[PDB]
């Protein structure tokens, strides 16, 4: 009974759900040759969060815990806590702690720490390689490479703030990160569990519509494209509204509010992704005041006007 | 079309549960393709949905369109969806009628490609 | 069908750019509905795409 809707927000007013940066544009392209299975930015239209998805835009790709120095190196192992510093439980029915990065790459940021007794603070450059054998966030363990071998204290609250991604400039340019390759959340040779499902258009002639940002680069020649299936604001809005899906597909029109002219229409599937009728890779050209408007409940086989 | 209408919440669309012309219950098992008088072409028929509330005689009429090519056009099973200009006026369980006026065409599209008078709907 | 193919990035699909049945250029302005021999029904026709590399005679299907 509660009416469904999507937020009245332009693309540039919204936030990527897979890294804490604003959305920049809309992109569509074929994706049948690889598995599209991001775990952040996953939410049903009636507001069930999936995968590793949580509500806070600023907690995406952040880690919190205490750190232990790896002797003979500038590397630290973080024993993960929950995002509110409560204990982390590896037996929960999730693939990894909420907000864990959902792509294989090298994420650079800053590890900060406060000593509780005197309020002294410290921060250091840190990189987490999410393809490393020591990247095991599902079991509460993540390794950071830092620029110090002594400065971090044990048994003190420590936070990783993500900034951007890096690439080895001596190898093929833009060969990493790989945004569609999930990390192995428990480390080597261990199957991921409790994943939000892979996503693909099921209607002939349709492609996913991606909400695209450009990740900051901190070194080398990284691939900084980052595509999410839902803006973080849609996740937040569906959770808040909790409106029941009346069919499997919500028909959205992308509208210029000055003229009321519809630029294109698309299908928002109830399990939480968008498709358009197009063949090939295309950067959508949109007015900066355009927004998505829910118009009606349709079925999986509604034929969209071509975009 | 005649029957009662159910609002599809969040939209301006209504589902009409078909009655017979004399307001009797409609029977999908009769040896006919669809209720007598059902449109027999695929297209977008525009008209007016009218309704009277029996307890006080209050009345209302709203612009309405039926797409007979829609998957929700199922008059043989007693179900037809209308697109209207309201999301609130129509009562449930009150006599409601669709009066046809004419046809429309998606005007950003090649002229005169719809309606298709020789394509039967899927009833 | 005969011609050259262009990969559709992100998919396992290819666009074939048609040649005539004798590998000559195809002319869309001829007074025909489509190239001679084109399927004349709506359906999903399965078969095999084969290709030869001119320079060394390597092949794939």
């Amino acid at each position, epitope marked *: 009974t509660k009416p469904f809707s999507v937020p009245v927000l332009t693309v540039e007013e919204m936030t990527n759900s897979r890294f804490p940066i604003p959305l920049e544009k809309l992109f569509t392209g074929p994706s049948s040759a690889f598995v599209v299975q991001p775990q952040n930015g996953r939410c049903t239209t009636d507001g069930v969060l999936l995968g590793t998805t949580q509500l806070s835009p600023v907690n995406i790709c952040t880690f919190r815990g205490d750190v232990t120095h790896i002797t003979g190196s500038r590397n630290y192992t973080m024993n993960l806590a929950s995002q509110n510093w409560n204990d982390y439980d590896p037996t929960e029915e999730i693939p990894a702690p909420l907000g864990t990065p959902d792509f294989v790459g090298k994420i650079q940021g800053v590890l900060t720490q406060t000593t509780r007794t005197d309020g002294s603070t410290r921060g250091h450059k840190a990189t987490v390689y999410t393809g490393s054998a020591d990247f095991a966030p599902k079991l509460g363990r993540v390794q950071f490479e830092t620029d110090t071998d002594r400065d971090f204290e044990a048994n003190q609250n420590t936070k990783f703030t993500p900034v951007g991604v890096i690439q080895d400039g001596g190898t093929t340019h833009r060969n990493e990160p790989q945004q569609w390759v999930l990390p192995s959340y428990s480390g080597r040779n261990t199957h991921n569990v409790h994943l939000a499902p892979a996503v693909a258009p099921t209607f002939p002639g349709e492609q996913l519509l991606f909400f695209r940002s450009t990740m900051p680069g901190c070194s080398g020649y990284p691939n900084m494209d980052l595509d999410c299936l839902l803006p973080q604001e849609w996740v937040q809005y569906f959770y808040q509204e909790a409106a029941p899906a009346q069919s499997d597909v919500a028909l959205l029109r992308f509208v210029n509010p000055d003229t009321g002219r519809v630029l294109f229409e698309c299908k928002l599937h109830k399990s939480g992704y968008v498709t358009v009728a197009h*063949t090939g890779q295309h950067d959508l050209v949109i007015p900066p005041n355009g927004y998505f408007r829910f118009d009606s409940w349709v079925n999986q086989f509604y034929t969209l006007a*071509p975009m | 079309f005649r029957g009662d209408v159910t609002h599809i919440t969040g939209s301006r669309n209504y589902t009409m549960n078909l009655a017979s012309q004399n307001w009797n219950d409609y029977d999908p098992t009769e040896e006919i393709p669809a209720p007598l008088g059902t449109p027999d072409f695929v297209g977008k028929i525009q008209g007016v949905l009218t309704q009277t509330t029996r307890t006080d005689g209050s009345t209302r009429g709203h612009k309405a369109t039926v797409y007979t090519g829609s998957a929700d056009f199922a008059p043989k099973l007693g179900r037809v969806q209308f697109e209207t200009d309201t999301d609130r006026d129509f009562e449930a369980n009150q006599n409601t009628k669709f009066t046809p006026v004419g046809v429309i065409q998606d005007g*950003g*599209t*090649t*002229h*005169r*490609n719809e309606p298709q008078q020789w394509v039967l709907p899927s009833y | 069908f005969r011609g050259d193919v262009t990969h559709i990035t992100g998919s396992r699909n290819y666009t074939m*750019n048609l040649a005539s049945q004798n590998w000559n*250029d195809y*002319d*869309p*302005t001829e*007074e025909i509905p489509a190239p001679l021999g084109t399927p004349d029904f709506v359906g999903k026709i399965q078969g095999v795409l084969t290709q030869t590399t001119r320079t060394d005679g390597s092949t794939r299907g």
Partner: nanobody
Framework: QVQLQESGGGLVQPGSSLRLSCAAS????????MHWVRQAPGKGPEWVSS????????NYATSVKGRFSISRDNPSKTLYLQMNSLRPEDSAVYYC?????????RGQGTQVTVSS
């Protein structure tokens, strides 16, 4: 009647860009594939480019690929040919042509001359 009128030709410098237009009337225009052809002196006509109704299918002669771009605006019933990196051998009368049912139609053409 079906009518097609090409415009936009002229005498231009090698390497320059030129945009041709074809104004159509007397049929829906939308719903029909449209074509550009050209004919140079002492040569038979040759196909240049084609486009379907929605513009999602286009094709080009090998001799103009990567340099020419076909487009259309169905509401104004106008076909366009954007010609970049023009070369002397691009000189010809450029015609717009279509096929409706079992008949072909083409405009009178517009002359393009590329020369130093």
């Amino acid at each position: 009647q079906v009518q097609l009128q090409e415009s936009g030709g002229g005498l231009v410098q090698p390497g320059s860009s030129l945009r041709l237009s074809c104004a159509a009337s007397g049929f829906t225009f939308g719903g029909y594939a449209m074509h550009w052809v050209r004919q140079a002196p002492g040569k038979g006509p040759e196909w240049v480019s084609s486009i379907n109704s929605g513009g999602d299918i286009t094709n080009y002669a090998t001799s103009v690929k990567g340099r020419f771009s076909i487009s259309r605006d169905n509401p104004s019933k106008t076909l366009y040919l954007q010609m970049n990196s023009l070369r002397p051998e691009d000189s010809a009368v450029y015609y717009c042509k279509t096929q409706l049912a079992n008949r072909d139609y083409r405009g009178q053409g517009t002359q393009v001359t590329v020369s130093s």
